[PDB]
Design a protein around this ligand. Structure first.
Ligand SMILES: Nc1cccc2c1C(=O)N([C@H]1CCC(=O)NC1=O)C2=O
Ligand SMILES: [Zn+2]
Ligand SMILES: [Zn+2]
Ligand SMILES: [Zn+2]
Lengths: 54, 336, 787
């Protein structure tokens, strides 16, 4: 666990996780982990991500 | 390697989703400890694992690269592998060591190996090729002269001769790749066939067919059937909207027009490079696969599925600037 | 099912010929190899006197006579394509002529790559060893001591892979080989000595850096002069250490020498034949020196004349030279000291019937007798001819002087339609001058197709010949378009119109086009003493095969199998196409079925449904291998010849959509010949199909019941327990399915030639075989003999 909820990067601890979390923030954080698409809400990413080679 | 037509059991990586052509590189990126544990034992014993194609056939792969990037308190292992022998699965069992039957390669003598006159056998060796359109007629005449002893002519026998076909394929690959004339293409036809199967922008169903083909001569013809008819490449999720065509296929650098790349998160993307196409974001440069280019996402205008990326950068008069990169998995070749 | 093959006509083409003293130490023998047949003769003052003919279980590839010291006479060595080696002696107990085997062995290695210039077999001058070039880089050596009965051998490595030709050198301190080879630097000639103790190569007497680019022949000049002669495209050279001589005779620049023979054992006179039947004499101008030595001054080559396209040659005596041929008739010719009026020193003494190569046939009974003849196409280039076989075998001949491609029988006009290909050359004037007057140019009526629908080297021109079935005269010769190539031809009925038509399928071969992008299907009518252009259809590809499919013209354009409809407007309309992935080369029908196949054994069974009005795929069975010809046995089984010299039989299965669509293979047999065409007809059992091969052999394939098959298969195993073989070769090994890598025992076939050998065996063996299983077997064999 301890995974990021934007770029979907995985971290070993919850400390380094929150250290990273406050770095994307730019009115469009949710980046697709396949094609680098920029989304606003998690509802957008969950759909497009499953429309991708997987 | 494995004995031809032998039955062995080989571990399978569950993360892999590719259909592996023999003689093709398989980039990887492993986070979880179960995959990383498998790579370790492989380098100790056989260095071989299975890459199932989707579940009838597949290809074995050999580990030839192995990096270790322990970063941010987690071990990210970066492994590259190359494909070996085709096979047909017997029984998979996630305990996933799969029972595997090795498929042998079917080699055939020359078409004239039986109708060659014993008097003309000594005249079957040629002086090496000058590095022409006139020369290849002499090759046809000399080697296929003995077709007059058969019911079929000379020109027909040429369309089943490895060497005759292999050159015509190379002729087209020189338009796609300006740097593809020397030892970049194997002399053996069995390997030459597999090398073009990876280098061809074709959907998965075609890739499986070219794997089931036994004779390289047939494979070479099939690979030439595709390169001549399918001039158009479309989007697979909407079909009737053609994206780009063969006439624009370019090779940016040495690794051909289609090379395998990896995203920062671990997803292989075989991106064909072209010059223009028809039918999201701003130029970004982080992890740019092509140095001196800024990537921008692109999608289709009917189904809004992912098509690829467009790379545009400044520098100076760097060649080229306006060029695209479409992922193989989301492309469908069609006949205009 | 289970089938039965029997040879109707023994092979006619000669692939080997050597002189020597085989039968009697004083007799002059001429041994001749007709593929699997070995003909022995004795040279008299007149000509050839037949002595014996034997059949080996294996296609003869290397045949050489040799006389070891302390031996009654010369011995014979034969190596087959299956790598069967044997030493043969002659034995005549009064009147019973026997060919015993002194030693026999198999020399096939598990590994090895067959060389580019094929198998080469050479024997040491002093009969010390037998060199065999079986694979690239490997030089097998059989030592010649009279304790080597199994012919156990040892190999040696060769750093040279692309070696062209190799001989044993004459007049050397040690057994020395000399060979021409090629490496990326060029083409070279090198020699090695052969040690039997070390079992490896030692340094060779000499080595010459460069030689001609296309050097092909190596001749070992005997003791008087020594050394070796190297013949190439335009240069003949002589090498022996410090001695070197070269000539560039313009008379041999036109073609390439491919066969040779030594006249006298002095080596002064050499015979040379090329690819176009020409004959040459190579003269070694020896200079008598002042101290018992003899040097070599110059080299000379003179044009003797013109024979049949020569495969092998051999001088006999008093100017009698045997000319062996694979395309045309074998010839016995006399040489003349004086140049005749024309210029040739050669006059034909005899001719030998050579059916091969049989490229097309058609079963007819022109006499309306109900028996069955066979009108085939034979030869190539000037050796082109038709051969009418009857029943011994009455073999007529109709010389054409050009290559006959296809043949068919028309009856409404009582004539034959024949496709022909003549070779021409570009002149400075801008034409295509022919080499010799042939059936195309030497005709009564000419006809050049104008059509215009698609508006100094060799160029092919295809033609359509009409030949009356009585006189076999050249009635009409139709010249197709410039750059057109005719492929198929058939004579049949176009449905309702009683007018019988000649239909030819053509193509449009250019060198810049690797695939056929155009073509034509032309219909012709011969009735008013001339050919009629009854409309031609423009397709977009090659028309490989055509069949009459019940009032509908079945055509094959590349991959598109396509039915054509004869309309009442005297034209053809496209009914329905069955597109395919493979190239539709072969095409055979059996009522409502269609059998499509390509050059790579891709058997594909279709089925035309009349109510649906279209073809539908019923089954298929791909198995990549070179297929030469294919025919339909019946509604279920199918027969074809593939790979090396094998015959396959596939059939349909006995519930699943994927199992009823997979044609099961049941018949595997190594025939021994390359079958180019099957034909239905004859001259209990069911189905009579005949085939014509390249070596001239004709055979019949018939079916059998499971009872007779199981009985004949039991007899075959018992027959080969008493019958003596030539080289002590197992029959099952010979008939086993052989490619270049696959080797499987035969199944699904019965050798008729082995069955009809029960009548020629004695009574002690006639009753030994039939034990636990006499007149009963006689009746069976007698009935089968009628086929
Ligand atoms: N920065 C991100 C973030 C998430 C996913 C991706 C990238 C990214 O750059 N690529 C690709 C495509 C664009 C590129 O040039 N290189 C890549 O690795 C991704 O899939
Ligand atoms: Zn993040
Ligand atoms: Zn995405
Ligand atoms: Zn789309």
């Amino acid at each position: 666990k301890h995974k990021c909820k934007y770029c979907s990067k995985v971290f070993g601890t919850d400390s380094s996780l929150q250290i990273h979390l406050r770095s994307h923030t730019g009115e469009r954080p949710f980046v697709c982990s396949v094609c680098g698409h920029r989304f606003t809400t998690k509802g957008n990413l969950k759909v497009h991500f499953h429309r991708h080679p997987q | 390697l494995h004995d031809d037509d032998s039955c062995q059991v080989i571990p399978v990586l569950p993360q892999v989703m590719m259909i592996l052509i023999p003689g093709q590189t398989l980039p990887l990126q492993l986070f979880h400890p179960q995959e990383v544990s498998m790579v370790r034992n492989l380098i100790q014993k056989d260095r071989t694992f299975a890459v199932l194609a989707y579940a009838q056939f597949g290809t074995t792969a050999e580990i030839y690269a192995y990096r270790e990037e322990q970063d941010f308190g987690i071990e990210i292992v970066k492994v590259k592998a190359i494909g070996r022998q085709r096979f047909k699965v017997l029984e998979l069992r996630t305990q996933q060591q799969a029972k595997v039957q090795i498929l042998p390669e079917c080699v055939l003598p020359s078409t004239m190996s039986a109708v060659q006159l014993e008097s003309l056998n000594k005249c079957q060796i040629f002086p090496s090729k000058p590095v022409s359109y006139k020369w290849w007629q002499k090759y046809q005449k000399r080697k296929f002269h003995c077709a007059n002893l058969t019911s079929w002519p000379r020109w027909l026998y040429s369309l089943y001769d490895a060497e005759t076909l292999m050159d015509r394929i190379k002729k087209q690959l020189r338009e796609w790749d300006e740097n593809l004339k020397d030892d970049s293409l194997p002399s053996n036809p069995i390997d030459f066939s597999y090398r073009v199967a990876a280098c061809l922008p074709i959907d998965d169903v075609l890739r499986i067919q070219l794997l089931k083909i036994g004779s390289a001569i047939q494979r070479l013809r099939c690979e030439l059937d595709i390169m001549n008819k399918c001039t158009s490449l479309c989007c697979k999720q909407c079909q009737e909207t053609e994206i780009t065509t063969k006439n624009e296929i370019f090779s940016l650098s040495l690794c051909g027009p289609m090379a395998a790349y990896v995203n920062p998160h671990g997803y292989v993307h075989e991106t064909l490079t072209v010059y223009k196409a028809c039918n999201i974001g701003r130029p970004s440069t982080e992890h740019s696969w092509f140095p001196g280019y800024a990537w921008t996402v692109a999608q289709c205008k009917i189904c809004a599925s992912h098509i690829g990326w467009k790379f545009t950068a400044t520098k100076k008069d760097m060649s080229p600037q306006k060029f695209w990169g479409l992922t193989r998995s989301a492309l469908l070749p069609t006949i205009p | 099912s289970y089938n039965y093959v029997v040879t109707a006509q023994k092979p006619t083409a000669v692939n080997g010929c050597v002189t020597g003293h085989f039968t009697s130490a004083e007799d002059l023998n001429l041994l001749i190899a007709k593929n699997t047949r070995l003909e022995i003769y004795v040279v008299t003052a007149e000509g050839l006197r037949p002595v014996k003919e034997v059949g080996m279980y294996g296609k003869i590839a290397v045949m050489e006579l040799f006389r070891p010291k302390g031996e009654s006479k010369d011995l014979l060595f034969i190596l087959t394509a299956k790598y069967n080696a044997c030493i043969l002696e002659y034995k005549q107990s009064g009147e019973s002529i026997d060919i015993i085997t002194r030693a026999h062995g198999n020399v096939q290695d598990r590994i090895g790559r067959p060389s580019e210039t094929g198998i080469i077999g050479i024997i040491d001058p002093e009969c010390r060893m037998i060199g065999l070039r079986l694979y690239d880089g490997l030089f097998k050596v059989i030592p010649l001591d009279r304790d080597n009965k199994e012919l156990k051998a040892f190999n040696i490595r060769l750093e040279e892979l692309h070696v062209i030709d190799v001989k044993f050198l004459y007049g050397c301190q040690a057994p020395t080989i000399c060979f021409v080879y090629q490496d990326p630097q060029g083409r070279h000639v090198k020699t090695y000595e052969v040690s039997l103790r070390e079992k490896e190569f030692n340094k060779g007497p000499w080595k010459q850096e460069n030689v001609e680019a296309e050097a092909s022949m190596v001749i070992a000049v005997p003791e008087p002069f020594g050394g070796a002669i190297i013949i190439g495209q335009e240069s003949i050279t002589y090498h022996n250490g410090d001695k070197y001589l070269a000539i560039a005779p313009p008379i041999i620049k036109q073609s390439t020498i491919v066969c040779h023979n030594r006249v006298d054992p002095n080596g002064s006179r050499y015979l040379l034949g090329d690819m176009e039947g020409r004959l040459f004499m190579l003269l070694l101008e020896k200079e008598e020196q002042m101290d018992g030595t003899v040097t070599l001054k110059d080299l000379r080559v003179e044009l003797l004349g013109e024979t049949s396209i020569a495969e092998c040659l051999t001088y006999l005596d008093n100017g009698v030279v045997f000319v062996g041929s694979r395309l045309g008739d074998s010839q016995l010719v006399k040489l003349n000291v004086d140049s005749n009026e024309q210029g040739s020193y050669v006059v034909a003494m005899e001719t030998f019937t050579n059916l091969g190569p049989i490229v097309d046939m058609c079963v007819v009974d022109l006499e309306r007798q109900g028996q069955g003849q066979l009108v085939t196409c034979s030869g190539a280039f000037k050796e082109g001819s038709l051969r009418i076989i009857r029943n011994k075998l009455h073999i007529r001949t109709v010389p054409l002087y050009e290559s006959p491609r296809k043949i068919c029988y028309q009856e409404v006009s009582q004539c034959f339609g024949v496709l022909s290909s003549r070779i021409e050359v570009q002149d400075t004037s801008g034409g295509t001058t022919a080499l010799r007057p042939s059936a195309s140019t030497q005709a009564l009526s000419s006809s050049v197709s104008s059509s215009k629908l698609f508006s100094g080297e060799e160029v092919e021109v295809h033609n359509l010949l009409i030949i009356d079935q009585h006189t076999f005269e050249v009635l009409h010769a139709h010249q197709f378009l410039q750059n057109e190539y005719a492929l198929s031809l058939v004579s049949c009925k176009l449905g309702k119109d009683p007018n019988t038509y000649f239909i030819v399928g053509t193509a449009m071969v250019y060198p810049e086009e690797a695939e056929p992008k155009q073509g034509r299907i032309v219909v012709f009518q011969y009735s008013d003493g001339k050919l009629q252009t009854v409309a031609e259809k423009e397709v977009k590809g090659a028309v490989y095969s055509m069949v009459e499919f019940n009032g509908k013209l079945l055509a094959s354009i590349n991959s598109t199998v396509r039915l054509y409809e004869w309309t009442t407007e005297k034209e053809l309309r496209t009914e329905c196409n069955h597109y395919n992935n493979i190239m539709a080369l072969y095409l055979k029908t059996k009522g409502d079925f269609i059998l499509v196949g390509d050059l790579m054994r891709s058997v594909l069974l279709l089925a035309y449904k009349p109510m649906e009005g279209n073809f539908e795929e019923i089954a298929r069975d791909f198995n990549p291998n070179w297929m030469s010809a294919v025919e339909i046995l019946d509604d279920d089984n199918f027969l074809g010849a593939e790979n090396a010299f094998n015959l396959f039989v596939c059939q349909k299965d006995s519930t699943t959509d994927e199992e009823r669509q997979h044609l099961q293979e049941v018949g595997l047999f190594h025939l021994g010949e390359f079958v180019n065409v099957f034909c239905h007809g004859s001259l209990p059992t069911q189905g009579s199909v005949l085939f014509g091969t390249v070596n001239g052999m004709i055979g019949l394939v018939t079916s059998l019941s499971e009872s007779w098959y199981n009985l004949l298969l039991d007899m075959q195993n018992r027959l080969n327990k008493v019958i003596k073989s030539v080289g002590k070769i197992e029959h099952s090994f010979w008939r086993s399915f052989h490619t270049e890598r696959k080797t499987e025992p035969a199944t699904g076939f019965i050798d008729g030639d082995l069955i009809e050998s029960f009548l020629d065996i004695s009574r002690p063996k006639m009753q030994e075989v039939v034990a636990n299983l006499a007149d009963d077997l006689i009746k069976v064999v007698e009935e089968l003999t009628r086929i």
